[PDB]
């Protein structure tokens, strides 16, 4: 049947319906800190989330997304390795079934408990659907989560999970400020990649931050209580919704720090 993270439809099977799975700029990848090149011509990142407007939280069967109003330049990302402005459309996570796995990208082979992806699309393309047809159409900001102290800004997200337990369920989620999900430092690694789930479009400039955020065990735990399945179907916990690291190939991971 269709893709998932199961034994019979997981990442190793994706290439059959989506041949781009074995492409040249596939994500995620392993970030080798010692092999990454320090680039001083990289400008700092500019995250402007002060006018961010969250509208809804949804369980799409693969993860839960928090969508934002992208009808205007409310929550934008610019600078760094980017040209022009990028609108935040939505954010989601990738987590594991154990605290030692869940992230997609790895640092020196190290996996984190989960990984946050704040998806943005280039405004010079008018809409998201047009941006996913360009090599510089998207910019995803990736943040790692490690278990430790609880992250206050994440709790509002965690409390709403009960109402979007099964595939297809959604719920109003207004007034969520994405700024409480940012680590103190904006140091990052940048490289050209792609979406990590089908259709696996190589339209992404990946911006992975060096500094991870801490989330309590109890917070990550509630993520694992979500279901892949729709209501009325056999229960399949939403765990391990992460894709293995892919071959870097003819690519270079640049760093904005040394
Ligand atoms: C189908 N859509 S819409 C969107 O914003 C998005 C993002 C990613 S990710 N895990 O590579 O960021 C994967 C798929 C996807
Ligand atoms: Zn993702």
Listed in sequence order, the residues at least 6 apart from 7 whose beta carbon sits closer than 8 Å to its beta carbon are none
Counting ligand 1 atoms within 8 A of each CB, the residue from 5, 64, 65, 92 with the most, and so the one to mutate, is 92
- Catalytic (active-site) positions: 62
How far is C-alpha 56 from the chain's CA centre?
17
Residue 96: C-alpha distances to residues 31, 103, 146 (Å) = 19, 7, 11
The answer, yes or no, to whether any atom of ligand 1 lies below 6 A from the CB of 117, is: yes
Measured over the CA atoms of residue 144, residue 145, residue 149 and residue 154, the dihedral's sign is: positive
Which of ligand 1's atoms lies nearest the C-alpha of 195?
11
- Experimental method of this PDB entry: X-ray
Those residues whose beta carbon sits under 5 angstroms from the ion ligand 2 are 117, 196
27 in Cβ contact with 190 (< 8 Å)? no
Q: Is 143 left (phi over 0), alpha (psi -120 to 50) or beta?
A: beta
Give residue 180 CA to ligand 1 midpoint distance, Å.
Answer: 21
Q: How many CB atoms lie within 10 A of CB 120?
A: 30
Ramachandran sector of residue 109 (left: φ over 0; alpha: ψ -120 to 50; beta: rest): left
Length of the chain: 258
Domains and CATH numbers, the chain: 1-258 (3.10.200.10)
35 is known to lie in a ligand binding site: no
| Nearest by Cα to 256 from 86, 37, 48, 79 | 37
Q: 119 in ligand 1 pocket by Cβ < 6 Å?
A: yes
Spatial distance between the Cα atoms of 185 and 191, rounded to a whole number of angstroms:
19
* Residue-by-residue DSSP string for the chain: ----SSTTTSTTTGGGT-GGGGSSS-S--EE-TTTSEE-TTPPPEEEE-TT--EEEEEE-SSSEEEEE--SSSSSEEEETT--S-EEEEEEEEEE-SSTT---SSEETTB--SEEEEEEEEEGGGSSHHHHTTSTTSEEEEEEEEEESS--HHHHHHHHHGGGG-SBT-EEE--S--GGGG--S---EEEEEE--SSTT--S-EEEEEESS-EEE-HHHHHHHTT-BSSBTTS---B-----PPPPP--S---EES--
The β-bridge partners of 110 are 107
Phi-psi region of 99 (alpha: psi -120 to 50; beta: other; left: phi over 0): alpha
Closest CA relative to residue 111, chosen from 103, 123, 120: 103
Max intra-chain CA distance, the chain:
54
Ligand 2 mean position, distance from CA 94 (Å): 6
**Does 196 count as an annotated binding residue?**
yes
Q: Is the dihedral of CA 154, 157, 161, 166 positive or negative?
A: negative
Distance 4 CA to ligand 2 centre (A): 13
Resolution rounded to one decimal, in angstroms = 2.2
- Residue pair 82/139 in contact by the 8 Å Cβ criterion: yes
């Amino acid at each position: 049947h269709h893709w998932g993270y199961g034994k019979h439809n997981g990442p190793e099977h994706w290439h059959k319906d989506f041949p781009i799975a074995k492409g040249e700029r596939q994500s995620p990848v392993d970030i080798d800190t010692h092999t990454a090149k320090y680039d001083p011509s990289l400008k700092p990142l500019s995250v402007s989330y002060d006018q961010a407007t969250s509208l809804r939280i949804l369980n799409n069967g693969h993860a839960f997304n928090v969508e934002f109003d992208d009808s205007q330049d409310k929550a934008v990302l610019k600078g760094g390795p980017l040209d022009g402005t990028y609108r935040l459309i939505q954010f989601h996570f990738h987590w594991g079934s154990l605290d030692g796995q869940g992230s997609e990208h790895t640092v020196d082979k190290k996996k984190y408990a989960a990984e946050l992806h704040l998806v943005h699309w280039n405004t010079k393309y008018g809409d998201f659907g047009k941006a996913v047809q360009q090599p510089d159409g998207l910019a995803v900001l990736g943040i790692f989560l490690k278990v430790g102290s609880a992250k206050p800004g994440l709790q509002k997200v965690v409390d709403v999970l009960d109402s979007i337990k099964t595939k297809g369920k959604s719920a109003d989620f207004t007034n969520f400020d994405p700024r409480g999900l940012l680590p103190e430092s904006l140091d990052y690694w940048t490289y050209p990649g792609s979406l990590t789930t089908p259709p696996l479009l190589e339209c992404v400039t990946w911006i992975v931050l060096k500094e991870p955020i801490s989330v309590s065990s109890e917070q990550v735990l509630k993520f694992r209580k979500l279901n892949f399945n729709g209501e009325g179907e056999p229960e399949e916990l939403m765990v391990d919704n992460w894709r293995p690291a892919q071959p870097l190939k003819n690519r270079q991971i640049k760093a904005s720090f040394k």
